[PDB]
Design a protein around this ligand. Structure first.
Ligand code: ANP
Lengths: 660, 326
DNA sequence: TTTTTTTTTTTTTT
């Protein structure tokens, strides 16, 4: 009956080694003596116990004798018991007072204080087997990995260490603390779980503590307390939810890197649990070096169904290392003194793509946008720059957007399918797995007061079309679907790459012929740049040399420009939206006059032909908002006459490209 | 045990032959001819196929998206072009991948979300056609007859070169990188030759961009040719291929050519020459079609087994695109 | 002593 066999592994002395491991050390007073206090001092919760110092401490325990039994390898070979033992002794040497505990102050702090004071005092009357040590903690324990440059002491092989793929993950890895890397997916929302969980009793009281072991347990009532028990007949008892403790729990799957995988073989995502202070550490779609204890959790069931028992297991979180996490106006002040903020930063836009700085020129207006205005009633006048692209097929205009949202504040990079109607209109898309019927607005909701970036904009169908057809009135998205009648803010900025119908726009053809969009939707944008690709035996040379500059090199540009990086740039771009220019009346009247002949030449050209007229109000609205945009590029707030005129250059330049 | 079957085992004495032949400078054409024992000529198409059989290397950017190196082509022409049967040669020597007649779907290589579970309460995906075809040859009978709805993920198959799955479900984006060749018949009758390529496409539009080559093959009659057409067809019913697979496989992993500027000093002149000329004849022209000059040259670069790209390889490319559009 | 299940294929339909 249960054969039993000796093994070199013994917990007995290792416990002692743990006592000498903590509070006695130097190289990092020591870290284990007063930080432990700072936990007991209640300024910190997570106890970070590094495998690093387990190694360096064995440098103190070997080299530097007397020799000691294995640790980090014994750790990562078992991984679970070392939080039930290495941590259990922590109760012994923990500082008493500690400093300034108060009582309430903190809720339930007085509960447990008076728990054990009423416990000892009700135990004092009986004396005139104790609340388990895991009950009073208020500190989690997190092991962290050793990569390591000092793992090169060396123990060599024993280091994992490596962030192996789940394909690399194996059945002998059960009960082994390891590193794994991969993308976050579906990341279940944080929920409380449970820990002991004291249920009160009805007649003479007392209490009992049901340990929280596994994923589920049997609840119990009866009466345990000897006094309520047997007299009479049995003391009833219920759960006290304020006598309960809950460890933090958020479980999240992490998918494979997909280049870790053999060529066939669909990605295999693995199950992970989060416990403790490391809750909220992980968010959807995030690559990280994640280390943790990997244990089987059968079953519930089913049961006799499985067989063999076929564990199905899971991972628990231990450590998180995440790849890729005024004096700032001074960081801006080489650019402020640089001069040529508008043309230079216009060159700085998408430095990868060659040519058409005239396009980037307006993209510049977009990144800052602004300033809006509020009419005092009020109804917002955008304030938001909706500018569109055109021309085809590739142009890598997608790159313009691709970098823009990557850099421009609160960006959304989208396409026709792409962000759907329900990818743009908040509905009730049933939530997969964890339930139920949650609401996620995509696109126009997701990043608001920021740019939406579209391609395949004609393939958005009508699902997006009528809603965005509203979003040019901006400042809303209405939803009557299901039981929810709200109109939620889409404050989103709009931009699209317009890909004309197959296979390219035809120069003889009248404008809007290439475009498959509604006629009512293109007066809704302010301005648009059509991108024609016309063979020139000159520019296609430098182009093909630009295409052959790959793969020869990595860095494309030279002779000469120095790219302007997003951080420092974004801070001026966010420095500008605060400026809020106010038009002088001189420039205002000038915005009227040339706009009259603008309201004449698009009209006196009559029949559509070139078109479109009329230079509608929205182009004046725009021209004004564009000088409101252009001024912050100057700072000012005084809105120069040429500060208007610079938008005036872009006005016709947008159109009239329809000729070539 | 579970042994796979049909990699391969080259010893020494064999690869010594591989290289002994590799020294010879007409071998490209040679390898091309042996591909179709029955089939007449179409050697330019043959070459194109081998060019797809290498994979044309790859280059992955650092901290950015990859530049696809594998080759995607399509056949078009009147019935009895041997297009389907030609695909069936790419069925065996090619070391995978799997071929399909039109339909096709659901989403082809899309898993289509095995549901529910199977088993023990775990919703599962399973290898789709295109997925199973990762780093292999997808072939299509009647790519013109596939649904317009499939085509969506097909775009996703070629440029994006991956598989996006939202369905139930698991959001994994898994590598779809694949060599893909298909055949389409003239939309309407024998007018493939008479009609413009526009309306002759049968599958617009971005579908056309991703294609490295569109091959129009005429059923047109030459009685002079028809005699030839007959005799070899009759002696049908009445330079070695297996070794060709043993060679191609070796040319994949050893070695990748990288590049030399010599091809570059020419194919550029060639591309602009296309844009200033090929628009006085037909369409289309894009940067992408030039990126194929890279891939094409690189393919023949693996054919020479040269440690590096060389100018004459580019001359092989300049060869192939002419006949591509004329 | 009982456990637990909605996509994908095809269809007939305005
Ligand atoms: N050298 C050859 N050239 C052309 N056809 C050949 C040749 N040798 C044999 N054939 C025969 O020609 C026929 C080719 O048909 P094929 O066009 O490949 O099928 P298919 O294209 O799917 N039919 P369709 O879809 O209408 O074009 C087959 O019967 C082949 O056996």
């Amino acid at each position: 009956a249960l054969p039993s066999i000796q093994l070199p592994v013994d917990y007995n002395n290792l416990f002692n080694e743990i006592t000498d491991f903590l509070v006695t050390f130097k190289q990092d007073g020591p870290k284990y003596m007063a930080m432990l206090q700072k936990v007991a001092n209640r300024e910190l919760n997570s106890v970070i116990i590094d495998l690093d110092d387990i190694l360096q401490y064995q440098n103190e325990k070997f080299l530097q004798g007397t020799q000691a039994d294995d640790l980090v390898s014994a750790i990562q070979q078992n991984a679970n018991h070392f939080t039930e033992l290495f941590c259990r002794a922590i109760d012994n040497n923990m500082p008493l007072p500690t400093k300034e505990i108060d009582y309430k102050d903190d809720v339930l702090d007085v509960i447990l204080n008076q728990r054990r004071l009423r416990n000892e005092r009700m135990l004092s009357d009986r004396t005139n087997e104790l609340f388990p040590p895991n009950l009073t903690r208020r500190y989690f324990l997190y092991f962290k990995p050793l990569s390591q440059n000092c793992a090169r002491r060396y123990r060599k092989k024993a280091i994992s260490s490596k962030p192996l793929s789940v394909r690399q993950i194996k059945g002998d890895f059960l009960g082994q603390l390891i590193t794994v890397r991969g993308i976050i997916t579906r990341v279940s929302d944080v929920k409380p779980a449970v820990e002991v969980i004291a249920y009160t009793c009805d007649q003479c009281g007392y209490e009992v503590f049901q340990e929280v072991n596994s994923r589920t347990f049997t609840p119990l009532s009866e009466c345990t307390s000897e006094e309520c028990s047997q007299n009479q007949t049995k003391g009833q008892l219920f759960m006290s939810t304020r006598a309960s403790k809950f460890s933090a729990f958020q479980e999240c799957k992490i998918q494979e890197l997909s280049q870790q995988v053999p060529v066939g073989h669909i990605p295999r995502s693995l199950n992970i649990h989060v416990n403790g202070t490391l809750v909220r550490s992980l968010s959807p779609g995030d690559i990280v070096d994640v280390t943790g204890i990997f244990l089987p959790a059968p079953y519930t069931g089913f049961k006799a169904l499985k067989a063999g028992l076929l564990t199905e297991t899971y991972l628990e979180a231990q450590f998180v290392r995440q790849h890729k996490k005024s004096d700032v106006e001074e960081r801006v002040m080489e650019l402020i003194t640089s001069g040529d903020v508008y043309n230079r930063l216009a060159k700085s836009i998408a430095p990868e793509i060659y040519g058409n700085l005239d396009v980037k020129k307006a993209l510049l207006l977009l990144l800052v946008g602004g300033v809006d205005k509020r009419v005092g009633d009020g109804m917002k006048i955008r304030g938001d720059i909706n500018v569109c692209l055109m021309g085809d097929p590739g142009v890598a205009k997608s790159q313009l957007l691709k970098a823009i949202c990557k850099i421009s504040p609160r960006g959304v990079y989208t396409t026709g399918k792409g962000s759907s109607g329900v990818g743009l209109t908040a509905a009730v898309m049933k939530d997969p797995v964890t339930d139920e019927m949650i609401l996620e607005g995509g696109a126009l909701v997701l990043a608001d007061n920021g740019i939406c970036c579209i391609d395949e904009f004609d393939k958005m169908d009508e699902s997006d079309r009528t809603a965005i057809h509203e979003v040019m009135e901006q400042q809303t998205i209405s939803i009557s679907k299901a039981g929810i009648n709200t109109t939620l803010n889409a404050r989103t900025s709009i931009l699209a790459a317009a890909n004309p119908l197959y296979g390219r726009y035809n120069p003889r053809l009248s404008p809007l012929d290439n475009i498959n969009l509604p006629a009512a939707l293109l007066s809704r944008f302010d301005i648009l740049f059509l991108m024609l690709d016309i063979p020139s035996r000159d520019d296609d040379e430098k182009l093909a040399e630009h295409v052959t500059y790959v793969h020869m090199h990595n860095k494309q540009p030279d002779l000469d420009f120095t790219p302007v990086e997003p951080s420092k740039m974004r801070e001026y771009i966010a420095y500008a939206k605060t400026k809020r220019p106010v038009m002088s009346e001189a420039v205002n009247d000038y915005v009227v006059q040339a706009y009259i002949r603008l309201r004449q030449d698009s009209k006196r050209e009559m029949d559509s032909k070139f078109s479109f007229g009329q230079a509608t109000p929205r182009t004046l609205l725009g021209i004004i908002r564009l000088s409101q945009a252009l001024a912050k590029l100057r700072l000012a707030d005084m809105v120069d006459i040429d500060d208007v005129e610079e938008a005036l250059r872009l006005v016709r330049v947008s159109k009239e490209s329809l000729y070539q | 045990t579970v042994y796979p079957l049909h990699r391969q085992m080259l010893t020494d004495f064999d690869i010594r032959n591989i290289n002994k032949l590799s020294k010879k400078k007409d071998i490209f054409d040679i390898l091309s001819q042996s591909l179709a024992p029955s089939i007449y000529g179409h050697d330019h198409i043959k070459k194109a196929i081998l060019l797809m059989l290498m994979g044309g290397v790859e280059k992955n950017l650092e901290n950015g998206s990859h530049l696809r190196g594998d080759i995607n082509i399509l056949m078009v022409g009147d019935p009895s072009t041997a297009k389907s049967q030609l695909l069936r040669f790419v069925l065996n020597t090619a070391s995978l991948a799997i071929a399909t007649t039109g339909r096709g779907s659901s989403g082809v290589g899309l898993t289509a979300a095995v549901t529910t579970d199977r088993e023990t309460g775990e919703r599962r995906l399973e290898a789709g056609a295109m997925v199973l075809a990762d780093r292999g040859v997808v072939c299509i009978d009647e790519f013109d007859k596939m649904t317009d709805v499939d085509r969506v993920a097909i775009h996703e198959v070629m440029e994006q070169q991956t598989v996006t799955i939202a369905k139930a479900g698991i959001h994994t984006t898994l590598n779809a990188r694949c060599s893909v060749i298909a055949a389409a018949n003239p939309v309407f009758g024998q007018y493939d030759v008479n009609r413009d390529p526009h309306q002759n496409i049968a599958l617009p539009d971005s579908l056309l961009s991703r294609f490295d080559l569109l091959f129009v093959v005429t059923d047109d009659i030459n009685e002079i040719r028809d005699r030839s057409i007959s005799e070899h067809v009759l002696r049908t019913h009445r330079v070695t291929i297996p070794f060709l697979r043993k060679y191609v496989q070796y040319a994949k992993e050893r070695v990748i050519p990288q590049l030399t500027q010599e091809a570059i000093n020419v194919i550029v002149k060639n591309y602009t020459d296309l844009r200033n000329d090929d628009n006085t004849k037909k369409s289309p022209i894009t940067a992408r079609t030039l990126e194929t000059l890279i891939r094409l040259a690189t393919a023949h670069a693996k054919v020479r087994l040269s440690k590096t790209v060389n100018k004459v390889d580019a001359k092989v490319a300049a060869n192939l695109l002419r006949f591509a559009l004329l």
